[PDB]
Amino acid sequence: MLPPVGVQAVALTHDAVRVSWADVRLYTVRWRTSFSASAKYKSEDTTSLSYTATGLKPNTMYEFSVMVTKNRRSSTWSMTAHATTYEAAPTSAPKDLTVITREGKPRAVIVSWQPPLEANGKITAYILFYTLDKNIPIDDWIMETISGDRLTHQIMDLNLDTMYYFRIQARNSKGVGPLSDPILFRTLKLEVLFQ
């Protein structure tokens, strides 16, 4: 039989994409992550001229193909349609948060991290929280906003021999992901620092 034509795939939500083609005959629609190792498909059957592929990973590009079947006779697969699903707030937190004293200038540290695994989109900005107090809530810490293109930041004029707390989170076009777990960094005292 003749495969369907005018196949187009349009992203709805961040996990839904609606394929739509033009021509009882049954249509089968297959899809697959275009950038992955698994060369295996997922598919579903319908009798409408459209179908919504759901349960997808956000900010990901998918390829869609439709065939038609009627009375034991199946057609070949149609031209593939490409669709990228919408973005979503990050799910993980930034990883490997590290604080190291800057040499040879004490009272200042260089904070280094790595982007989150589940960014679910392009990271617009990083938010870095740090404080001296053990009790005050997160919204009263010192806040520093670093661009998404930077993975390091310089903090200056800290206190000597004092325990600092560090929290970092990733932002995104549709919101901000969860904070990481606290990182404890103790600035050294001059006695230990010089030998």
Binding site: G104, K105, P106, R107, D157, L160, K189, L190, E191, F194
Partner: protein, 94 residues
């Protein structure tokens, strides 16, 4: 006959360009003290070094840069060598 102890107390009173030190001799009077060796710099006490008399308790550090984080060391010394230092952080007023 041996290296002296660390000073008993050290106080600093930073100014806009000056920094004033006030200290007191080691708690152990038996060990001889020939004088005191002061060190200061930014983020390091190795930058500048002066040595003063055993009878001095006050010293005025001059010609310092405004609004900076200085590190000050103070050690007593005698014919044997140098004693364990005392450290103090002082910040200049901009």
């Amino acid at each position: 006959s041996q290296v002296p102890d660390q000073p008993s107390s050290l106080h600093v009173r930073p100014q806009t360009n000056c920094i004033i030190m006030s200290w007191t001799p080691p708690l152990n009077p038996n060990i001889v003290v020939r004088g005191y060796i002061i060190g200061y710099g930014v983020g390091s006490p190795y930058a500048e070094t002066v040595r003063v008399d055993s009878k001095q308790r006050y010293y005025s550090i001059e010609r310092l840069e405004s609004s900076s984080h200085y590190v000050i060391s103070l050690k007593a010394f005698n014919n044997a060598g140098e004693g364990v230092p005392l450290y103090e952080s002082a910040t200049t007023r901009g």
